[PDB]
Amino acid sequence: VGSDPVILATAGYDHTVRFWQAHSGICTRTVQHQDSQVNALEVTPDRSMIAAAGYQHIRMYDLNSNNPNPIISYDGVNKNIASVGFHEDGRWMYTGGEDCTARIWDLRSRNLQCQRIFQVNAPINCVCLHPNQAELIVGDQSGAIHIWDLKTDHNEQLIPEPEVSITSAHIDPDASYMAAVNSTGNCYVWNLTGGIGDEVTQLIPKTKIPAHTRYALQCRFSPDSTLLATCSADQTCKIWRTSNFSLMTELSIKSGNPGESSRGWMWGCAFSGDSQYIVTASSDNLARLWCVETGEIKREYGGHQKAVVCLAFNDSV
Amino acid sequence: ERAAKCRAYAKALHYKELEFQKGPTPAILESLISINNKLQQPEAAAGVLEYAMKHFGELEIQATWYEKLHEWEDALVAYDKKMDTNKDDPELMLGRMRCLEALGEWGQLHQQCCEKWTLVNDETQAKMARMAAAAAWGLGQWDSMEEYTCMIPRDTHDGAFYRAVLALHQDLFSLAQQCIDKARDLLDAELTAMAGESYSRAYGAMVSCHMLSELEEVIQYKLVPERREIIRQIWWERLQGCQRIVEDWQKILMVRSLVVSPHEDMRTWLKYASLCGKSGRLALAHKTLVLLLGVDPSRQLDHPLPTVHPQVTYAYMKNMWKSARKIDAFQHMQHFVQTMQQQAQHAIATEDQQHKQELHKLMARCFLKLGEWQLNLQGINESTIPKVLQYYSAATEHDRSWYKAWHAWAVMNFEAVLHYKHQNQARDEKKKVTEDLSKTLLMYTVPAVQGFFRSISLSRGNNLQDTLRVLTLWFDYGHWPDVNEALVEGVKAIQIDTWLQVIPQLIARIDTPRPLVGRLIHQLLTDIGRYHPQALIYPLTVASKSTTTARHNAANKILKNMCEHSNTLVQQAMMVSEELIRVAILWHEMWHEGLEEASRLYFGERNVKGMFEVLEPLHAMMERGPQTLKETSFNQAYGRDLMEAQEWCRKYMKSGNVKDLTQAWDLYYHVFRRISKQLPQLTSLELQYVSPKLLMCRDLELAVPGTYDPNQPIIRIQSIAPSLQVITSKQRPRKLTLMGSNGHEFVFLLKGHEDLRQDERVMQLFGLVNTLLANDPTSLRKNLSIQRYAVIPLSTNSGLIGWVPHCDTLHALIRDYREKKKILLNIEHRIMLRMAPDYDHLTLMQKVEVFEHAVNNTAGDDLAKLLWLKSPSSEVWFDRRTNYTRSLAVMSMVGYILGLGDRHPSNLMLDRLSGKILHIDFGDCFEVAMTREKFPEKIPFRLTRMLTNAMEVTGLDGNYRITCHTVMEVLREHKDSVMAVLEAFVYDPLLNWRLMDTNTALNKKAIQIINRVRDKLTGRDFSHDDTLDVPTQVELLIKQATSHENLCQCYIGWCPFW
């Protein structure tokens, strides 16, 4: 279940983290995550274990021991933990909390204490790490985006449109683009000045996509750096060309009649390695596998009783 | 039906709205502004356009919107932009002109008429005439009037009218006589042709019927020389009286202009000019004054002003200040005054006494402005302080009476005191220091006190602010002799009446350590006891039973002092309050809470020292022996057990066992189980078992709690109803009912365990806001008020609350409708939990969804809909709604300034007969509700979905928002009176306990709160640096009150979905 080539994980308000087999929609194992909804799921680069950011904790179940319970809990923080991110070399973990702090966790050591804390006024909605492992982008509810240099500690901040909360931000593998998405439903794209190794790493504004009318809930670049995806409270995941910044494919779950009142938000998404498919987390209790080109619903992952807010997806050799 | 016709319109509006409900169409939107206009509901309809705007920019041209929004000044410059970019466009010019005839711009309306006379359009030729005749009329040019009148048909009421004017100029009176009656019957038939769905043309028909009857007095003025005073008086009276917007009054004056040139009217035109600048038509008011002066728009701008007509020059001066030119305005004031005092001192040859007097009174007004403006231009500092005091005192000299002049001077002295205090706390943040300061403070304190006094006597019936102000200096200045003297002087001079306004503020300082201060308080209080006791007994009785010695001591002295004088009234009131307190928390009820608390401390806290403090006084309380049958029948069933349960407790006190102590709890848990069973059976209390003394009471001289006011014959407790309903609640309050000596009944709520004192101060504040609202004309025009109720505290625990008739809680009305219509009461709640079992821990993002999802699967009607099913007609329905919307908006703004939190559906209620809204429970005041730990409020006032819904559709745009500015406008103006009151209980010695709960000195805390308030009253509430005007701030607030993000966070009990 971490031994299968594909890792696919789903979590939400139903107190379970369920694991799925990508190509069939059979649920493999399910784990007990009680006393909280799951805010975020991320599988460690190590493929050993998966993190579950929740309310005032990050419980980390195991993908190797194929059965037990949390290997690691992280407590002693109040209000939600909203984002989790990992550093390639095993031992770092970065979190953003409603408690207004980005935190760095030493995974190879004891302590519910964290090796570092970065404080901001305003809850931190997302935390994301520049491919170079030297910088952490941190977006908060004020609308400010913080670039935190992990060496210099030199915080540098940037507000786009905002008086509006930025919801999630991401950065393409090739470190050329950084994207932020906000509550207005906007998507900002910056070009990356690769300062790197003896750093500057600047950000140059490029486009502002009117991605959605309603809340934009997350953004993510395809491995390719070809595509940018946007999940939203308008029950939609829109996929944008990086060359054009035009719309390529739209996946949606909007009824079929205006008098249905919806049933479901589009919470998260994750591309496949080859950037061919996309997985989709929704409040209708289902995860979905789409073909990014046709926008075909290629599979439905049904199991959870209550809503789904989380995906984790893994393709590594 | 005449009253039967509006009923039809009301009922159509109900369906017409219910149609709009299903789908907003420009079709409905049309037959909606119209039907609200027939119903002569103007502003509500204005909101219908506000929505029409923000959704359909589709009767197009942003000048057709500025024109329909009566914003002529905007539509004019919009039409110039629309014409100079476009071409000729026949209609664009028609509107361009209509703006001019409303703005009273005859200069341009006449030019634009002649200068453009190809006018190949024939309708364009017809309308053209009506306008360019009135334009001509205002411009003198009568030849032009006749030319343009000879184009208006004699069929039109307008055509028949202007003939009556051209005749009256050329002196053809029987021509004019007939023309008037023909224009009447051509307008009489015209008010039936558009049988309702017309403009303010039935409202402006009153402008035409006014002008026609005035145009007949203008006839009377021409031949009969003996109405030259008669006609001028009614003209003058029906002016200060009448309230017709600027524009109509131009026309009304133009009729009177045929007969009296402005120079003989002077007062008439100044009064008109006065209103042009108040409504905000400065460039118009200027032209009025330029005419009256008979000198330039002072184009010779570097020159001195003409002192030819002192009264007009002063108007100009303040128009200049309200205009842009305000350093220039200030400058002309210094010189105008210097010119005036010479025109007095030298020019007054004795037989000139009236001119001397009115001249000295104009000067006082000048000095008040000089002081006013100086403070505005420079603020308050060491250079300005003496200068304005100088200006104000000068005014004080020249008017001697006049509230405002003595007021200004007091407040300046008092602000001079504050300036140095707050400068010296600045010093001490970083011995001869205190000395010069003592000299400083004392120098300004004594005049302040003096000024506030002479100002209070000149307000009489309207001086809450100034009176409280006296107290701040009184209390605040631990009395250095000089200050005390001024006080005792004033107390002698001022009426005793005054102090009633302020009784609780005085009583809060009975136990004043400062010895000179207390002395006077006691003496004053006793004298207030002498004339109007009653106004004193209840509050003094509270005090005389107080844990703090000095309080209850000094309180008794004043009561003793009242026995020489009203003894049995002191005795009656003494007992009635004692008994009521017994009845409020019964012997077992106190035990039940005392046992819960005792087990929490022992079994869940290992605290026997707290536990013993909980039990011992309950034992001592009964040690006195039963005094009512209820206290005996209790003593049987429980007493022996308890007296012996204490036996074991005190065997432990000495033995330090734990087997001794467990024997006690063995007994305690016996009686607890016994009482608990009987508790939900307490659904009534009978006076003959519970307090026999109260049943006994017949025809007392004691007044029915909180009914006493001078002016009004005293109502006495003639009898008390023998049964009290017990509302089965957490605090099981009683529903005591009394009989009045007038005959009528009085119902109260006898509360057990809430310090009722805060609520009382709030009612006090409300009292004020209510005066302020009855005094602002607009507010009085619309009936804006807060429904208030009686609050008579009886101790720190208990009190009495006036029952409001015809009321049910919001919650009550819904719970009914919901069960009647077979809807699960708590459905939104159950929907939310089914979706998110962990709701309270979700992220904001996550919460908003669940909340939205609940709302989208439930009715927003309920309230709106049950209020329709309640109504016996449709006009009754409609009015209850107009009441509702207004009353709610009033308390929305006031509640914001008070920082009134915790507005859940059982804390506000609706009068089912008026439809007006009413607030209860004023615990969480100031930001407190939002500052808390668990579940903080993000809301400023409840403006929840069903409340929005119950308003007219086009709600917040219509009546609500308008009423919001009006109310908030009043509050900003009167910011000081409001701040006196609030300040008066933030720093209240016995009420400071409400902000130390930020835990679950205060000097610095109390300061914040009061700043918080000032911010809110000076548009500094939002961003620190912007000073937001009312409509922005209001907009901002409605925004905050409606944000799903703000509502989804509210504790679920508050029902953000109701």
Ligand SMILES: Nc1ccc(-c2ccc3ncc4ccc(=O)n(-c5cccc(C(F)(F)F)c5)c4c3c2)cn1
């Ligand atoms: N702390 C409080 C609570 C309630 C009241 C208060 C005051 C006047 C009322 N006048 C009329 C009505 C009519 C229906 C009515 O239900 N109430 C009312 C509302 C809430 C709570 C209660 C209580 F439990 F205290 F009885 C009564 C009331 C009133 C409640 C005052 N102070």
